[PDB]
Design a protein around this ligand. Structure first.
Ligand code: GNP
Ligand code: MG
Length: 168
């Protein structure tokens, strides 16, 4: 059983914790309880293999930015999450990707672009915008809803596959 060190990143309130708690506990956290940092562990089957997911749920609040360097060193793949109704969180992705490449000293780091809250009406970030960003970064782009569970498994399983190829 291969362990995978996933890190969920993104601006405050985009749904990083809700996506994680949905994946591992199958329930939707309705209240906004801002994260500092929490670790989770979930065993799954992806492409006929048993793997353990080591998931770090990080803080979007800028006040805790001093924790980023340490978790970008140890993590192996990054779920970069924005909310489809938060233009700033989409723009923040550039800044996360840059800091990750800096700390990894590499232009090829496993990551997946996640546009969350797709259950909502009147998104301010259209799909075409996010596709072009992800294509330019050379990473997958998956639309999710932590509330309905749409795309949650797909987002985490795709990141596992990205880490799988980088190691091999
Ligand atoms: N409608 C909708 N609401 C969502 C979705 N995901 C999260 N939310 C809601 O948005 C709020 C923030 O979610 P949360 O997961 O705590 O965000 P976070 O990115 O972990 N915030 P922090 O960086 O402060 O921990 C909560 O009220 C939550 O219920 C989603 O897919 N759809
Ligand atoms: Mg959180």
């Amino acid at each position: 059983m291969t362990e995978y060190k996933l890190v969920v990143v993104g601006a405050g309130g985009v749904g990083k914790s809700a996506l994680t708690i949905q994946l591992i506990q199958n329930h939707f956290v309705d209240e906004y309880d801002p994260t500092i940092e929490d670790s989770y562990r979930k065993q799954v089957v992806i492409d006929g293999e048993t793997c353990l997911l080591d998931i770090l749920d990080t803080a979007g609040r800028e006040e805790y930015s001093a924790m980023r360097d340490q978790y970008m060193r140890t993590g192996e793949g990054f779920l970069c999450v924005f909310a489809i109704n938060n233009t700033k969180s989409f723009e923040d992705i550039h800044h996360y990707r840059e800091q990750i490449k800096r700390v990894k000293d590499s232009e090829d780091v496993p990551m997946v672009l996640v546009g969350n809250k797709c259950d909502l009406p009147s998104r301010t970030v259209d799909t075409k915008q996010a596709q072009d960003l992800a294509r330019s970064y050379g990473i997958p782009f998956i639309e999710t809803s932590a509330k309905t569970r749409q795309g949650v498994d797909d987002a985490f399983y795709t990141l596992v596959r990205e880490i799988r190829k980088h190691k091999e």
